[PDB]
Design a protein around this ligand. Structure first.
Ligand SMILES: [K+]
Ligand SMILES: [K+]
Ligand SMILES: [K+]
Ligand SMILES: [K+]
Ligand SMILES: [K+]
Ligand SMILES: [K+]
Ligand SMILES: [K+]
Ligand SMILES: [K+]
Ligand SMILES: [K+]
Ligand SMILES: [Mg+2]
Ligand SMILES: [Mg+2]
Ligand SMILES: [Mg+2]
Ligand SMILES: [Mg+2]
Ligand SMILES: [Mg+2]
Ligand SMILES: [Mg+2]
Ligand SMILES: [Mg+2]
Ligand SMILES: [Mg+2]
Ligand SMILES: [Mg+2]
Ligand SMILES: [Mg+2]
Ligand SMILES: [Mg+2]
Ligand SMILES: [Mg+2]
Ligand SMILES: [Mg+2]
Ligand SMILES: [Mg+2]
Ligand SMILES: [Mg+2]
Ligand SMILES: [Mg+2]
Ligand SMILES: [Mg+2]
Ligand SMILES: [Mg+2]
Ligand SMILES: [Mg+2]
Ligand SMILES: [Mg+2]
Ligand SMILES: [Mg+2]
Ligand SMILES: [Mg+2]
Ligand SMILES: [Mg+2]
Ligand SMILES: [Mg+2]
Ligand SMILES: [Mg+2]
Ligand SMILES: [Mg+2]
Ligand SMILES: [Mg+2]
Ligand SMILES: [Mg+2]
Ligand SMILES: [Mg+2]
Ligand SMILES: [Mg+2]
Ligand SMILES: [Mg+2]
Ligand SMILES: [Mg+2]
Ligand SMILES: [Mg+2]
Ligand SMILES: [Mg+2]
Ligand SMILES: [Mg+2]
Ligand SMILES: [Mg+2]
Ligand SMILES: [Mg+2]
Ligand SMILES: [Mg+2]
Ligand SMILES: [Mg+2]
Ligand SMILES: [Mg+2]
Ligand SMILES: [Mg+2]
Ligand SMILES: [Mg+2]
Ligand SMILES: [Mg+2]
Ligand SMILES: [Mg+2]
Ligand SMILES: [Mg+2]
Lengths: 128, 224, 87, 160, 33, 88
RNA sequence: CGCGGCUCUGAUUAGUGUUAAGUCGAAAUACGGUUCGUGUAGUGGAAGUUGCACGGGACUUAUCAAUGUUGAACAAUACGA
RNA sequence: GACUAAUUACGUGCCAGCAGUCGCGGCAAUACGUAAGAGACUAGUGUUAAUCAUCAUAAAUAGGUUUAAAGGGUACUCAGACGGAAAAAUUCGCCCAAAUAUAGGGGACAAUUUUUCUAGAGUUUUAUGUAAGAAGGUCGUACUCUAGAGUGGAGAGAUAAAAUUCUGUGAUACCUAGGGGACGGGUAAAGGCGAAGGCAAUCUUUUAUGUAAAAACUGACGUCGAAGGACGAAGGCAAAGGGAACAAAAAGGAUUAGAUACCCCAGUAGUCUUUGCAGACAAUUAUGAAUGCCAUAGGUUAGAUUUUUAAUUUAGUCUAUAAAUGAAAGUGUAAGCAUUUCACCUCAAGAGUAAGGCGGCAACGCAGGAACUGAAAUCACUAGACCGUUUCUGACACCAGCAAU
RNA sequence: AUAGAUGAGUUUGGUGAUGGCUCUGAUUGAACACU
């Protein structure tokens, strides 16, 4: 649990939209036809709810759980085979939404390359 | 629905329709009930409709999905906070009997708390201090504590004279041949005597039960 | 129904006490000096922020609790909800 | 969408069944369109945009609602005054016709037939007291207001 | 379904379960298991 | 610890036996007599006193019964006011 | 010519439907006299019956050892079923 | 005869016969046969067969599934259906509005798309509380075996009562010292947890949700979900362990008209461990999941706020009611008002059966008819009667006594 | 096309439901019996 909540701070510090706005070259998606960039109010706090952070937090949980189901006696844990399936389906939905929402922004590619998320993780149907 | 269909609100509509025409078609209708014309122009009042009740206190602004909107609210006044303070500092002030029975409901017509604690129609009680305090705390701009001390001290000097007058009034009466009956100190003790005896009889009769049942606990009935 | 009871256990205890014709004095320590509790110097509740310490002993109504009278539980709740947010 | 109109119809039935003098609705232009038609037809007593608490009952018309911006749009609600005459609600039944699963549209000649109490399409003829509200390009209208303007459109609900 | 009617299904299922046990051998000879 | 529940609607709120059905006051005396015969014997002399007490039982008159207890009448007055209702 | 499908027939054999007047028990409906049913595995001429877990469509059908009070005297022009 | 307009007499006697449905006929039949009368249609009249309608009786219009046919064991999910706020572009869907309408108009709504918004849905801030799950180790009460040629020296255990059975190779009873296997007392509650199945001794390790209050953050990212896959009680199959106790089977002793049985002496699979198979349950709330909404009261569970007394409030759970709803029983955080979506139902019986097929080592599972035969099956309620049902009330009903057969 | 929407017998000790069956209406490129 101490590493779980310590990893949550790493995801907010790495993929936090309040940090990638300045770390990446083109974080936001490209503008559309006629749309012009306008200033918006600043964030009152850190970015903990963006799809990048949530997808990163889900990745840490999927590893901590999938690594326990593969350990000694992990096959005997039949109830948490739903928990792993429920974490992958929660990440599939956010990846599927962020894909069309970000329209290939540099902030979308940073998440994939860093977390190693391949199309198999959201494209088709996750069958476990 | 166990309840029955009450049509009390439609007695006039139902009675006026039954009296419009005659059951024997071809004849004029008979005279209607005598009450039909009496309430002709006095219709019933609307019932069962739930309105937004009076808000005696500001409703919670932060609430986004408030419940109990059609529920009457509690009545609270600025004096409630003051009454609780006084009667908690003077618990034995509750032992002084107070008559909450109304006479004509016109008590507040002769109450001018700018004068003092002694008003017309009401007795000198903890309520007088709260009303006098509230007046000072609002008109003279005093604080809750300052206005409390002032009205509170005026209240003590009046109570002292009331107790000093009982003692002196009885002392002088005997100096001129005045005698009185029994006082509470004596009457109160006599009642304890009569009640103490009842306990003595119970204890004396209840102890015999244990000593008898205790000695008989052993099965010494052989009488060896 | 109106849940009521007789009030003579306290109504008449007040009249029987006042029949003793004795005041209530301040608690003394053990030169018996019976001082009334209604004195203007001791019986006061309104104080000024400039009120120093030497005159804080005369009062009788304090806003804070008596630390020795609280239980170990009531004292922790006090430290957490009254003094901590007053730094 | 049409789901909000369907919730507005069942809610008003439950508020009238409970004999409530006031009732709140989510603040949307679609609900406002139907409420204005109900008020225009005489089924409700008032319409007022406000917060999560009802405005002052007595000063309801002279109530001053604050401007609706993005800082409070989430807490806005439409407050409706309900009528009750002769120990009976004036808005007893609100039966929807077009639903999320199917949007029922009627033509001008079908509305002319339903207005005189003859079935046409998936609708039924109107009887004494019943009303029908159609969502047309000219706004939410009553079936007799629609045939007068000679337009069809989406049928919302039948008000008994 | 009442208990009275469930006892009708109870007998029909037991008679069938009892028939298959009895004919299991000849169904095994004819390759009909 | 929780407080007593509020009884649900009952057909009738009452106690079965209003008056305590006390036991025959001598069935206890006989047990003492039967106790001596088991320890001291039948024709012994120690049990000569308990036997006299047993013979004293039946020679005495039976105490008259007490007046009925009106508890059930008062329980029926406060039923609807003390429980969730009354069953029909 | 071969393989497959389909139709008809087949010693022998199974199931079920109908049929008041036969025979053997008494399983269910009441605490049905071993609670009854679900699943599963056995067992017995038959209905049945046994183990294991489960359901109430069975026990809310529930009804006092708290045993029930001198809760502020008496008398007056007060009080008066 | 009634449905269905229209009657008697005689004959027949559960026979002969009538009959679309219910039915009629057993010696005083308006129902059969004859006679007459009556009620109808008419060159047609009846009957048989078929079709529509009756039949909201496969319900798109327009049904239903707590107890009557009918809710999947479970919810994560691809396809699919449905799903916020304020504007804009496009289609010109939609409407005028047709004649399969060229060309236009109207702009609420609909489809694709764009930009903003934060009420839905989520993330962070170690919540609290908690028998969800899993791993590696233990604790304890009892039981059991062995040993001490222990003490003691004839019974013990079983049952309604017995018998089989245990015991002089020393039992039961009372101890000491070792070994073994499972099980989980109190706490404990209308209590809690998980998608369900299910989960209750203890330490450490390990795992996903959920709940409360404040802020912050993302900005419709949502709900349902055929199929596939996963999980899924007990019993069961397979392999290797374990084996105290319990206990199908097999067997013995009783009871009984007989007794497979209920009871008893014993007792193998099995229950337990590890790895697979299997997938059926009263897998239940006889009630799929989810959303919006409707008046109260009394408890209870985990928080939060407060003048922490006690109130207020969020999310659960239960009891009793109002409006209402229901065939009623009842429900009333739903069996109400509505909506979304999936599953399933279409008289009984045959039948969840047959055949072919698929899955499995097997047991069995999934899927799933028709023939033959019926006018009824079915549900809730009402008043009785009955009970080897409770609690009362009368009677030589019984007890007791005397007499008698 | 604006007159067009209907029931009846039959389950029960009885009542209310559920649910089939049959009759009531119209018809045939019909057949058969009596005419
Ligand atoms: K059923
Ligand atoms: K009949
Ligand atoms: K257009
Ligand atoms: K358009
Ligand atoms: K369960
Ligand atoms: K045994
Ligand atoms: K035997
Ligand atoms: K509650
Ligand atoms: K209903
Ligand atoms: Mg295990
Ligand atoms: Mg043959
Ligand atoms: Mg049985
Ligand atoms: Mg029997
Ligand atoms: Mg039985
Ligand atoms: Mg059984
Ligand atoms: Mg046997
Ligand atoms: Mg029963
Ligand atoms: Mg019952
Ligand atoms: Mg007739
Ligand atoms: Mg004939
Ligand atoms: Mg005849
Ligand atoms: Mg002709
Ligand atoms: Mg279910
Ligand atoms: Mg299944
Ligand atoms: Mg099932
Ligand atoms: Mg935005
Ligand atoms: Mg914001
Ligand atoms: Mg939210
Ligand atoms: Mg915790
Ligand atoms: Mg020896
Ligand atoms: Mg020995
Ligand atoms: Mg052990
Ligand atoms: Mg326990
Ligand atoms: Mg939960
Ligand atoms: Mg879902
Ligand atoms: Mg599936
Ligand atoms: Mg198993
Ligand atoms: Mg096994
Ligand atoms: Mg084995
Ligand atoms: Mg197990
Ligand atoms: Mg499996
Ligand atoms: Mg189960
Ligand atoms: Mg489902
Ligand atoms: Mg619970
Ligand atoms: Mg209830
Ligand atoms: Mg069938
Ligand atoms: Mg078959
Ligand atoms: Mg088959
Ligand atoms: Mg099947
Ligand atoms: Mg009855
Ligand atoms: Mg006799
Ligand atoms: Mg006798
Ligand atoms: Mg003789
Ligand atoms: Mg019956």
């Amino acid at each position: 649990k101490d590493r779980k909540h310590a990893n949550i701070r790493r995801c907010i510090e790495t993929f936090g939209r309040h940090i990638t706005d300045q770390s990446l070259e083109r974080p936001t998606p490209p503008l559309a036809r006629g749309v012009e960039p306008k200033p918006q109010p600043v964030r009152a706090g850190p970015d903990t709810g963006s799809s990048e952070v949530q997808i990163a937090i889900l990745t840490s949980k999927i590893r901590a759980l999938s690594k326990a189901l593969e350990g000694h006696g992990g096959n005997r844990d039949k109830n948490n085979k739903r928990s792993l399936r429920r974490l992958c389906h929660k990440r599939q939905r956010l990846l599927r939404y962020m894909e069309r929402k970000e329209r290939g922004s540099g902030r979308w590619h940073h998440m994939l390359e860093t977390l190693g998320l391949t199309p198999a993780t959201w494209k088709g149907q996750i069958t476990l | 629905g166990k309840g029955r269909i009450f049509q009390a609100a439609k007695v006039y509509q139902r009675a006026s329709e039954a009296a419009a025409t005659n059951i024997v078609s071809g004849l004029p209708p008979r005279n209607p009930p005598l009450w039909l014309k009496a309430i002709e122009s006095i219709p019933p009042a609307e019932i069962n409709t739930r309105p937004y009740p009076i808000q005696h206190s500001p409703p919670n602004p932060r609430a986004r999905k408030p419940r109990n909107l059609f529920r009457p609210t509690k009545i609270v006044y600025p004096e409630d906070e003051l009454r609780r303070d006084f009667y908690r500092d003077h618990p034995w002030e509750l032992a002084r009997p107070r008559m909450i029975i109304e006479l004509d409901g016109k008590d507040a017509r002769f109450l001018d708390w700018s004068k003092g604690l002694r008003q017309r129609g009401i007795p000198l009680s903890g309520e007088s201090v709260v009303q006098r305090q509230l007046w000072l705390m609002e008109n003279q701009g005093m604080t809750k504590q300052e206005a409390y001390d002032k009205a509170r001290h005026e209240f003590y000097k009046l109570r002292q004279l009331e107790q000093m007058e009982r003692r002196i009034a009885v002392e002088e009466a005997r100096m001129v041949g005045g005698y009185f009956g029994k006082d509470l100190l004596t009457v109160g003790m006599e009642l304890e005597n009569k009640t103490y005896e009842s306990w003595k009889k119970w204890a004396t009769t209840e102890i015999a039960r244990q000593e008898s049942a205790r000695a008989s606990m052993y099965t010494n009935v052989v009488d060896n | 129904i109106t849940d009521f009871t007789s009030g003579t256990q306290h109504g008449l205890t007040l009249k029987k006490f006042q029949a003793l014709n004795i005041p209530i004095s301040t608690p003394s320590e053990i030169r018996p000096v019976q001082r009334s509790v209604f004195e203007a110097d001791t019986d006061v509740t309104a104080f000024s922020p400039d009120e120093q310490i030497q005159e804080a002993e005369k009062r009788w109504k304090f806003s804070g609790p008596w630390l020795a009278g609280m239980t170990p539980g009531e004292f922790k709740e006090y430290l957490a909800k009254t003094v901590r947010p007053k730094r | 969408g049409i789901q909000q109109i369907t919730n507005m119809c069942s809610h008003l039935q439950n508020a009238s069944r409970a004999r409530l003098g006031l009732t709140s609705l989510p603040n949307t232009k679609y609900n406002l369109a139907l409420a204005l038609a109900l008020h225009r037809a005489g089924f409700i007593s008032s319409i007022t945009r406000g917060g999560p608490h009802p405005p002052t009952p007595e000063a309801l018309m002279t109530y001053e609602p604050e401007p609706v911006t993005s800082a409070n749009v989430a807490t806005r609600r439409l407050w409706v005054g309900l009528k009750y005459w002769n120990e009976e609600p004036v808005l007893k039944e609100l039966k929807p016709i077009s639903k999320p699963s199917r949007l029922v549209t009627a033509s001008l000649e079908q509305l002319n037939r339903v207005a005189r109490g003859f079935p046409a399409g998936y609708m039924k003829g109107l009887q004494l007291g019943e009303c029908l509200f159609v969502n047309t390009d000219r706004g939410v209208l009553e079936v007799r207001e629609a045939v007068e303007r000679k337009v069809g459109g989406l049928v919302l609900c039948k008000v008994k | 379904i009442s208990v009275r009617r469930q006892k009708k299904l109870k007998i029909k299922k037991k008679k069938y379960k009892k028939l298959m046990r009895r004919t299991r051998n000849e169904r095994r000879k004819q390759d009909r298991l | 610890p929780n407080k007593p529940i509020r009884l649900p609607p009952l057909k009738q709120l009452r106690v079965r036996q209003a008056n305590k059905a006390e036991e025959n006051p001598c069935i206890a005396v006989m047990s003492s007599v039967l106790a001596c015969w088991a320890s001291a014997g039948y024709n012994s002399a120690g049990c000569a006193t308990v036997e006299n007490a047993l013979r004293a039982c039946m020679d005495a008159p039976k105490p008259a019964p007490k007046p009925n207890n009106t508890i059930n009448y008062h329980l029926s007055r406060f039923q609807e006011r003390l429980t969730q209702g009354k069953s029909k």
